Amino acid sequence: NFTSNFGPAAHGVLRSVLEMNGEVVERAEPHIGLLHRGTEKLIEYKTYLQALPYFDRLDYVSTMAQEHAYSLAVERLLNCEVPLRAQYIRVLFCEITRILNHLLALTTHAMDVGASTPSLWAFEEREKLLEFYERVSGARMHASFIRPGGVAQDLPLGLCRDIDSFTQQFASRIDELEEMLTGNRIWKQRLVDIGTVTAQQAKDWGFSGVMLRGPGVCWDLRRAAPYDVYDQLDFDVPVGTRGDCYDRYCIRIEEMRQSMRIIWQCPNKIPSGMIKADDRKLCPPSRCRMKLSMESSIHHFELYTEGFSVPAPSTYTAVEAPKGEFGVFLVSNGSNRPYRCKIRAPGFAHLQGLDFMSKHHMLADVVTIIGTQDIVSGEVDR
Amino acid sequence: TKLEDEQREQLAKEISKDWSSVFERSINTLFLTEMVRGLMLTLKYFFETKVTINYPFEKGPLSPRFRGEHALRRYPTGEERCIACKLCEAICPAQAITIEAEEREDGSRRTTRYDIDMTKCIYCGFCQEACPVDAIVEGPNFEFATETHEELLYDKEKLLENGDRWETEIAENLRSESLYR
Amino acid sequence: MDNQSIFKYSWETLPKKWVKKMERSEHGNRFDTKTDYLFQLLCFLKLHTYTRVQVLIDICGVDYPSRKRRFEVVYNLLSTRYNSRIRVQTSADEVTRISSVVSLFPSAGWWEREVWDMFGVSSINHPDLRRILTDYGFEGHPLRKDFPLSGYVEVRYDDPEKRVVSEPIEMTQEFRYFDFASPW
Amino acid sequence: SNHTAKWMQDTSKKSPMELINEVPPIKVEGRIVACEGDTNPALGHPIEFICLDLPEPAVCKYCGLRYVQDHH
Amino acid sequence: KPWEITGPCADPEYRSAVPLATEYRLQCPATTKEKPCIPNSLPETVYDIKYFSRDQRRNRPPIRRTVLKKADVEKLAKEQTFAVSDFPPVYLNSAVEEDINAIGGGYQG
Amino acid sequence: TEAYIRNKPGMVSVKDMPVLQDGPPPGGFAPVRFARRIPNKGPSAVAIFLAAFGTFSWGMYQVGQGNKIRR
Amino acid sequence: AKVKASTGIVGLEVVPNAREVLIGLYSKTLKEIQKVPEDEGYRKAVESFTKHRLSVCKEEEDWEAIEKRLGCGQVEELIEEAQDELKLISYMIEWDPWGVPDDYECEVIENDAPVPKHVPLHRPPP
Ligand code: SF4
Ligand code: SF4
Ligand SMILES: [Zn+2]
């Protein structure tokens, strides 16, 4: 049994070591500490409103579902309701983020396997969506836009019209991409029956997201525990019949289309009203009030110096991120700094997956497995 | 693996119903019609126009809610805006601001040293939200790519004051964000 | 308002010998148990044909540097069939070999290695292999309340003297700590 | 002379203090004023009602404008 | 055009991805032709501020604790009795093998 | 701290005070498309097979006539 | 009629002997819990519901009908659950823990802290 190394597209930094035999991967094992930062230690020596950008930095492809999960955790721990327009725009952008992540993962998978034109077309579409981000608030990626209790700024005018234009042209673009890949005998023979996963060992190794929904078992948090407006937003939730690379791929495309259905359902129901709060003790007052009234200045000052204090208990909060069940565990006590905020990105489950499900294959199939897993070492290590 | 033998039989007994079906599927997989379809789509995109923004002459689209090279504005009278609240330093999530003040001679309070080591300053935005007088702001300039770390350690307010070379442009943005912010 | 059913049934049919505390909150239902029966309790679940959990979501450590039992291990795990999740939370001190669950849920080797180096809590059976997250030979366990934010020895720079080296910390612009507290 | 010497370096163009002394007083008519500039937002400088019952100008503590009562 | 015989390029419900200036963004984000006044409060609050009744936060019940001994354990074990029903409920859901063009003629969403 | 800021001009009560102008126009802009649709309109089986076989036979006949000329 | 097409899950494999295997498994579990363990708790529960499921499968006798009436996912999934339950019983009697000796505290804690409706909570299945 050879002992080969694998230190590679730019599909992240990761160190695979492979006990090999001929062209068979008898045992693959990843070394993962290669990008560590101490995000939990920092959050602790930090705060709530100051630690939001950390969640923005974890899993840096899907750059808003993380803030959405952290905001849900703080609200649950805090009992701070949020207005309907805030909920609606927040779901809208969570779904745009899902589409972003799916484009990137799917077409980077296509590049690992060998295609390139899908990568470039998907990256054009990603440019459009990132333009939506940077128009609404902040830079292209890492838009710290979902604070505890709602959003930071209202969205501009015309953004909905642009959303609609993108919706139509993007239905067409997904159709093009699927025609380009789904059905090409090369892609089919390269993807199908590569990395089968029975639901028993799926639930054992603790997969989530598309992975868990690949082979059989039909369970996503949006339908099970519908955290946000999602009820009024009926959708489809596809499910694969024989868990493997091809079925996870088709799941991803159907999830893109369902996300389009949601992204249209929102700008038809969005209830024009207020955003983000009704207490200038958990959400800071806007500029006019802050510079005209008196107690608004007191609350702005206290809220940007020490932040809000949340009570004693500890909670767990999960969100259907584009990858899987992104989890946050808060152990806050009294004071304004989050005691022991623990992350539960699905990267760990997916890498142990790689370990067991990458046996008795070839190195091209190892690359294919990483592709279909859609790993981001940022979130797997944090 | 006994079932796979049984499954592969039915799957063949199902699609191979008539002769037309087998013949069609065979010359389908034998004349590469999906290959031809992919090639034709590709050739269409080839003939079609491009994107290729041609950077150094026509830059990309932005939004007044942009974040970039910081700046310290000042009143129309030429009088500085910053008053040393320490709010920007307090809310800095990266602690990338250092600020040290003193009572001036005429009486008003101002900043003796104010610096933002731009690197350690990730560009998050909280600056322009904590300021009660709109002193510090993020002008829409992203072309500053010096060749020595020390520069990106923007100096003790001096270069930050020179952000006023954008004072017109920045001003525009602020007006368009006075409504909803 | 979520999973009173599974929790109630699990508590009313359990062998009540090995349950030290039960909390039916609305944040999350807690079975605080003794570290001696943890494997027994978890193997009861995942097998009983009503409260079958079958998936372990997280194994996180919490540090309380003011109690005799310093650490706190926590297992967050759901039931995909019965749409419910519970949080089994055990206590653990400095060196005290805690049982493993890699036999039941194979998805704990990585989470148990992570709780081996981040914290210092041991693990008697297999999963206590070498460290995972922290880089290499590392002095402390860098997530308790003692390992400072900037680390003991962390300067790491190139040396044309030889090649590259790791030397003790002499960082500039020391970490400022603001107070912000509020006596009401 | 010392503060602007601590922060400013050029000493060719006039310092902020010099400009805000170059602007003359306002000579308002009543007994109480409020300094922002000309807009309520987008110009900051929250309301800073300042009395005018002394024979010398009164500074504003943001953007010192030195209002002065006109008549007796 | 020579391709135009099969694929999305030969479908009347097909759109390209080169949105012209006038049709995509005819109003720049800065100087719009309107004047938006975002809401920030409800009238009831803005003229009847009352922060405890608004801040039902910190208005939560206290944490209630109880200890149990062998006597109470035995009593509960005896009084307790299961039933053929309401053990827990089950959360069952299965595949359906639905089409694609169904919902709203395959359009609305 | 909200009345005139939000809207000063002419209202008699706090209700019906502001003008918002935030969301979509009346109608939902469209019904949009989300389902795939790839028409299959190429010559399916017998057309292409007869094309291949006929052009092969005729090309062979032409090769024959040409080799006659060359001889 | 209508033997089966596919259970829908990848790990489970259909079996036409659903009724017979369920009868055998349930009889065995009834016998095991009937003779072996002490008459408390877990034993009470398992006796009750297992004899229930035995009776209902034996009476319905048509696997479609046994699913539709018993009200659980699939006969295969029920087979899995029964096998796992019997395995659990074996483990339990290997390390028989029944009976609280004395000096026993089980602190029941409860706080009714209200949480908003827009937070992920596993709403009960109807
Ligand atoms: S908040 Fe504004 S004026 Fe106040 S100390 Fe900072 S930039 Fe300076
Ligand atoms: S932009 Fe953010 S990172 Fe930079 S100093 Fe200002 S508040 Fe901090
Ligand atoms: Zn002034």
Describe it:
Chain B: [4Fe-4S] cluster 1 binds at residues 70, 92, 121, 124, 127. Chain B: GO terms for molecular function: 4 iron, 4 sulfur cluster binding; metal ion binding; NADH dehydrogenase activity. The structure is cut from a larger assembly and holds 7 protein chains of 7 kinds. In chain B, 37% of the residues lie in helices and 13% in strands. Chain B has 7 helices and 5 strands; from the N terminus they run αααβαββαββαα. In chain B, a hairpin with a 5-residue loop joins β2 (97-103) and β3. Chain B is elongated. Chain C is of the alpha+beta class. A 5-stranded mixed β-sheet of chain C has the order 1-2-5-4-3. In chain C, β1 and β2 (29-33) form a beta hairpin. Helices cover 52% and strands 3% of the residues of chain G. Chain G has 4 helices and 1 strand; from the N terminus they run ααααβ. Chain G is flat. Chain A binds chain C through residues 32-33, 36, 38, 40-42, 45, 76-77, 201, 203-206, 217, 219, 224-225, 302, 305-307, 309, 313-316, 318, 325, 327, 329, 331, 335-336, 340, 342, 344, 348-349, 351-352, 356, 381, and chain C through 2, 25, 27-28, 54-58, 60, 62-63, 74, 76, 80, 83, 85, 87, 105-107, 109-111, 114, 132-135, 142-143, 149, 175, 177, 180-182. Bound molecules: iron/sulfur cluster (2 copies) and zinc ion. One iron/sulfur cluster binds at residues 82-88, 130-131, 133, 135-136 of chain B. Residues 35, 45, 60, 62-63, 65 of chain D line the site of zinc ion.
Strand order of the largest sheet of chain B: 2-3-5
Question: How much helix is in the residues of chain D?
Answer: 10-25%
State the major sheet of chain B: 3 strands, antiparallel
For the secondary structure, the number of strands of chain B is 5
Q: Helical stretch count of chain D?
A: 2
Described by its quaternary structure, the protein is part of a larger assembly
Across the major sheet of chain D, the strand order is 1-2
Helix-and-strand structural type of chain D: mainly alpha
How far is the first residue's CA from the last residue's CA of chain B? 64 Å
Give helix and strand order of chain B, one letter per element, not per position.
Answer: HHHEHEEHEEHH
Radius of gyration of chain D: 15 Å
Given the C-alpha coordinates, what overall shape of chain D results? Answer: globular
Heterogens:
iron/sulfur cluster, zinc ion
For this entry, give a set of tags.
part of a larger assembly; 7 chains; F: 71 residues; mainly alpha; 0% strand; G: 126 residues; binds iron/sulfur cluster; binds zinc ion; membrane (chain G); Probable NADH dehydrogenase [ubiquinone] 1 alpha subcomplex subunit 5, mitochondrial (chain G); mitochondrion inner membrane (chain G); electron transport (chain G)
